[PDB]
Design a protein around this ligand. Structure first.
Ligand code: NAD
Ligand code: ADP
Ligand code: NA
Lengths: 494, 494, 494, 494
């Protein structure tokens, strides 16, 4: 039930978005954005830098001034605008899905049925929160009346990755806007197109000038300018652990702005012996291969109980070999190309590193096409905890299958990691599922499923996977300041 | 680890408690309270009636007047008082436990380790809620500041049963006092002693006069006087569905006061084929026989899958035969006498009715001693849905074991009842437990356990088992009035 | 900014709505509905009775069966449906507003700008709550995992009055539907039209058959049939205190169903001497006269401090005399006719009762036109607390102005009432506002404003003004059952 | 009602506290702690460093291990322990108050009546939260059961200042312990005594070894070691903005641990023309001079409306001159000495800087005694926003009085600051109070009062005054990790 795509969608937006107007970079420079499926340049995009970020923050701050349309606006109206934006996105669903595929490389079918669906649900869910995040009236001691107001944080800098251009944008705009904040967004240089188009819809939706500003550009330039800005009240980052540290330090060095980090992981997918074989195999495959493996919480560590190891591995390899790689606009395509050349090589490097360390290559392991950044679905057997491919996030179609004996054993092994973004357990036993879900040190533990995100459920990590949460009511906390007002009263009564 | 009990505790309180003072009934009348273990009169107790309830309500209302000590007192101080009450009760724990056994009949060991333990945990749990039940500040449209205050409901009438005199008292006083209400409590004529002694501890703890008033007496007299009183703002009742209807009608006929009912049930205990046999049998036994079967949520309908039916029944019968019946003060005693003669006969009648309808009597079925109201642990096999013993709450040590085939089948049969207080499921399968816990129409669904009450978890029923909840944060809603204050402000900003 | 109305809107729906189908009464009877502005019959409408209510409940019950489309539907989707209904109402906004005026009598402008605007905001508000009313995971003692599910209460009987036909409908449908209940609604015989038209839109919106059933008819027949029905789980009533008692008794006499009552009031509007005179006079006028005085929380007791009494009264009288009474479809019209002849006489009766008691008639006091049920804006001065016009709810354009000296005095006088729905205070002083908003025993206290309802702020009364609340998060509590599931786990850890 | 103090309290604890044991620093070094009233050394205290912090973190990590006594302990029991700690502190109340005064210098009367009272209230408040911080069950789309668990963050490093030794300790221990975290606390070198004694009480209360570890020592050594430790999950700091930046950078450079900062401020105290003169003067005086001005939210910028400026200044100067300075153990002493020599000089420097810049010295301005660090209550009039004493936090008994004309003016001037911890308004006007409380950019806005802290009300700052909040339910968020468990179920139903 998917409409025919325009395999060559036209690009209308490729500049810097500030105050609902399109501007060229102050430097006039532009950078190209590549179609990962062909390696060809799609178009030129304004290259924002420090001076462009400065103009954006200034517009954002002005839109956030006391008495401004955005600040005076009824909370319920913010919800109306979010719902309107959702409607416009649904109107241009087919176009956006195609553009997403063109710039990112993910299958159009998935782009339409998954990405945009979730974008719509995210925006619609948050529209509903706009006028429901209450403060409190507190029964403090003495003759006083005390209450709290949940005010917006202010100017929020949002730096998003390229794996889910639209979804990441929505996960950030949703809570930020619902709570009345203003945004300065820096989209990934590899996939700036869709987000820039949405900025056009944000204008058509009626959001006041300066409430949302998007600055396309490079990380060390535009991104760092945001993180170090003296007038940015908060910076939300989603990407590598490496850059996540840079952000945190730039924040402490500047104005002590709030910082939430959504880093990657080496998510353990534990398959117990009593698990439904058919389901576990299909889900473990999805768990890793989803979105060309370019998933922050990809199940890149598939722990399988010894009794079912051989059979599991056999089925997984068969499924991996049957995974159709090709043109993302083709309906049969299950896996498209990787985002860019840099990731293309980085992943080939990890594949090589895997063979070198003793991991048993069961299938794939090389380039899947001469044109574009396509990689064959790769699976490694008999992986060990000490191996590089079992410690570092590959972010590609490379599966690692480890073997284990006891449930107490797998707990320690799955937990022995610097990451803790997600985890999964497949079993039919009640006690085992409860034991594991509690023992596993991950922000999200799936039972007999994987990658089940609800706009309603919080998503974040433990340890070096980041701090703070996104989605659900918890996503609102990070975009809110608590002000307490305590008033002296004549005589307090219960 | 249980101290030696005074098998003949002295009684210090046996009058009406109003304004922290002991009074005789206006009529001067007194009624006897019996020791169910010997059938002997323990002592005389003031027989409160309408004129006494009138005095109590008057006292309560005065203590609730704006500006009074109780109304002005800091919420955190109410918590202090509840904690103080808990301390006093722990001080006299050994005494109270013995007095409880003397008047109620339950084993002293259970009285000490279970009842009083839960009373202490309940009072201490609620003590902590006293200053944490917040109102809200609401983001209403327009230039207004809107907020809510959670105010006490007022004079609360509390009519409690005899199965757990102390615990029932605590379950009512806890949320009511934490929220700042005043109480006029009517304790069961069969077990007024412990509650009256606690009233003395309430005065010792420092609660202002009139905050808690206890009127011992009969139901149709004192109880009905409370339910129909024009100045009682709320009545919480716990007992038979029969009287529960009288209470609700009395409330609609008077001042439209709030009403919460905690009626009995015919709670289904579903044992799946893959359940841990040893655990299931022990828990199913506990599920019904606990407190001489005098438990509102007793598992009086033990549904067992056909594959394990015969084995289950065998073990259950063995366990029932081994259940020690005798002097409640004896450490070996597992089951004491029933509360009184009326219940004694009522149970014997149901046992008789069971034989006559075709239910297979597997053990017991008659009187267990010539002195006291002791009944043999009875078990009925091959029970059918249409039988009386499978529809009406016996409230005695009489177990009903039914057989079933499919999971879809047992859902419908377990749900086919006018009651819906509790239910339980024993299984090792994840999907089965979740399917059942969701499909079962009961206020509380236990999985692989039974009678697991936390002072922190809500407890109430569906359908004709009552309305409203007790325990947990939900218990507070029933004792709170929501007042909304909407103020016009110069200019609203987020 | 109001579109031209069709002063003679066509009626498309005038039958009983069950299972998304239009049916005639089983009896085949019909009753006429009158246009209060002309006294002429608009059309004939199906006259539902017990038999029709029975059919409605059965349909509702079927739509609520486990596994049904409405029960399985994603919570987010129920919100989608409510938003769709809101869009349909907005589409037909001009028509509905005209039809509301035709049947009820309130000015078209008000119907368009106020009633319909509020209905859209109400449904859109609740659409957002659909997937955000979370249950809890409770940290109970022992090795257990305890949580709560907020389930729909079931089949909800909703009986609504005629003062605000559409808004009352929305206030009931919103929370009920967002929480997944099914409804059997009984609309007022004086104003059944708009609600029946909305049932058509409910069908067009996609709501499953039986989710919403409307049975137009009389109270003693259809209404009583719902209140006494054995299969209705909850009954929500809004109307006279007289009938509210009937409903509560009918509920306790039947199945112990849940009951929430939204009864009237004799709301105090207190004007302190330091209030802004211009604003207080305009607001007090609106507080009472709004909607032909046919408002449950009308400020029918305007208490004015002695120092500004003469001046206030003078301005109030002038404003009352200048209030334009006439054809509700005329833009200049501020006051339309009263709903029907019965109310017309009832008010004439109170006006006379006022004169007889000694209250000073300052203006109006008689019929305002020979056609329709128009009454002159009436104002009584120097009213006393003992007078009947100061104790009973007139529900008409009859203002009562009382004089007072101190703030301690007015508190006692404003509180001395069987009603406690709302109250207001006009003052510039912080301490006075806080003192009174705390002291006043009313479910809603407005400071320097009146009739400020937010779809997000709770609305209900104290004492004999009812139990339970509507609007805001609190409105969801009444349409929800709390199920507690407590699971045994291997070993609990924090 | 204050017991007679031991002006020379014994010191029982002066070492490093790890695993409920007292240890000397690994280096064996010790630093002296001075009595600011006499300048004499009280005693020697173990000088902890990196190696000591290492040992503390290890013990804390061990106590936090899955299956440990602290991890398995009932949430309600954590509350019992906190309540037992409070009891022990109350038992030793007079001793602790004396010790607090000896080491810090604040008046014994204040230490006893204010500090210790608040410590008890804080611990008792949080004891109540131990088992009431619920997770949620979320209505996610699809056939899934999704819920959240609120888990402890882990090993929390807590670095506290010297202005409120005991209170700051309780403010940190309360929420951290209530939520089941383990602590490694670094107390200020100027005031380590009281906290160390409390550690002894923590052992006596029954807290498992390793749950609380206190390491006295210097900042750049022990403090930095905690902030940069690889195994510390969270660091909460309270002190200078200067060090607060060091902490945040140390965290981003290490393990991306969570960071909450409680920095100082230059809190504006606005006195409107209509304020109660007597009350405003007394509160403004309290606002600034309290605790020798060593208060993070000291009202160091007293803005006064021009119409009442002269009278206000006059009264304030009179009140400052009558403030009794002297031996803190004397009942008549209102002001004790400053914490240490460094602060003593820093303050004198600001005083001098004040005179140099043109501020009008109205009283004091010099040393108040030859012995001890006493400074005279100083007041500066006609202060200007540009002046150093109007921008930098003095932290001493030095008041700045500024003049203003309009309410719109004062908001901008009050907001024009790097800080935003607190603020206050004195007015009798409702609209003014609401306008200001909303407009002021501060974490806490007081109306007609100052320094009103409730264990129940959140406390934190805006901008460079820090991030995160303390006290109230909000204090728990910082010490909790949210884990989401999403389980696949057979068929989801509402
Ligand atoms: N606002 C407050 O709550 C508050 C309280 C006390 C002091 N202060 C500020 O502190 C100023 C001067 O006193 P101070 O310098 O001793 O306070 P500070 O902020 O430096 O001291 C607070 C805590 O930080 C620790 N610390 C110091 N340097 C550290 C470092 N490099 N890394 C990690 N931890 C370190 C200290 O040992 C102490 O335990 C005061 O004038 C005021 O500005 C503020
Ligand atoms: N008619 C009544 N009106 C009010 N309360 C009653 C009435 N009858 C009994 N009660 C009270 O209800 C509580 C529980 O008793 P009930 O449910 O009637 O069990 P029983 O009467 O079989 O002992 C006791 O306080 C009892 O006195
Ligand atoms: Na200061």
């Amino acid at each position: 039930a998917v409409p025919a795509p325009n395999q060559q969608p036209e690009v209308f937006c490729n500049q810097i978005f500030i105050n609902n107007e399109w501007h060229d970079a102050v430097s006039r420079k532009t950078f190209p954005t590549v179609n990962p499926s062909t390696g060809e340049v799609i178009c030129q995009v304004a290259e924002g830098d420090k001076e462009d970020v400065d103009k954006a923050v200034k517009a954002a701050r002005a839109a956030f001034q006391l008495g401004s349309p955005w600040r005076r606006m009824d909370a319920s109206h913010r919800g109306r605008l979010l719902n309107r934006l959702a409607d416009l996105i649904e109107r241009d669903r087919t176009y956006l899905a195609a553009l997403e595929t063109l710039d990112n490389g993910k299958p159009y079918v998935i782009s339409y049925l998954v990405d945009l669906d979730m974008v719509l649900k995210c925006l619609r869910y948050y529209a509903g929160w706009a006028d429901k995040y209450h403060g409190k009236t507190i029964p403090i001691d003495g003759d006083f009346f005390s209450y709290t107001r949940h005010e917006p944080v202010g100017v929020c800098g949002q730096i998003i990755p390229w794996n889910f251009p639209l979804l990441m944008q929505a996960w950030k705009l949703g809570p930020a806007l619902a709570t009345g904040n203003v945004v300065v967004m820096k989209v990934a240089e590899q996939t700036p197109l869709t987000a820039l188009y949405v900025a056009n819809l944000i204008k058509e939706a009626g959001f006041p000038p300066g409430v949302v500003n998007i600055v396309p550009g490079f990380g060390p330039t535009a991104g760092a300018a945001i993180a170090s800005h003296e007038d940015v009240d908060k910076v939300a980052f989603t990407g590598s652990t490496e850059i996540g540290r840079v952000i945190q330090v730039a924040a402490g060095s500047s104005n002590l702005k709030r910082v939430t980090l959504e880093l990657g992981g080496k998510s353990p997918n534990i398959i117990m012996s009593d698990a439904d074989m058919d389901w576990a195999v299909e889900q473990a495959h999805f768990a890793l291969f989803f979105n060309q493996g370019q998933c922050c919480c990809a199940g890149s560590r598939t722990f399988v109980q010894e009794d079912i190891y051989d059979e599991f591995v056999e089925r997984s390899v068969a499924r991996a070999k049957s995974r159709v790689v090709g043109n993302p606009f083709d309906s049969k395509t299950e896996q498209g190309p990787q985002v860019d050349e840099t990731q293309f090589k980085k992943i080939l490097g990890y594949i090589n590193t895997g063979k070198q360390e003793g991991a048993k290559l069961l299938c794939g392991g090389g380039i899947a096409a001469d044109r574009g950044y396509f990689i064959q679905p790769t699976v490694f057997g008999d992986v060990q905890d000490g191996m590089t491919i079992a410690k570092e996030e590959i972010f590609g179609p490379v599966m690692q299958i480890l073997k284990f004996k006891t449930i107490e054993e797998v707990v320690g092994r799955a937990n022995n990691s610097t990451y803790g973004l997600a985890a999964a357990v497949f079993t039919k036993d009640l006690d085992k599922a409860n034991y594991l879900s509690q023992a596993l040190q991950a922000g999200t533990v799936w039972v007999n499923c994987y990658d089940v995100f609800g706009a309603q459920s919080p998503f974040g990590g433990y340890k070096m996977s980041g701090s703070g949460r996104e989605l659900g009511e918890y996503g609102l906390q990070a975009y809110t300041k608590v002000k307490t007002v305590t008033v002296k009263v004549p005589q307090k009564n219960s």
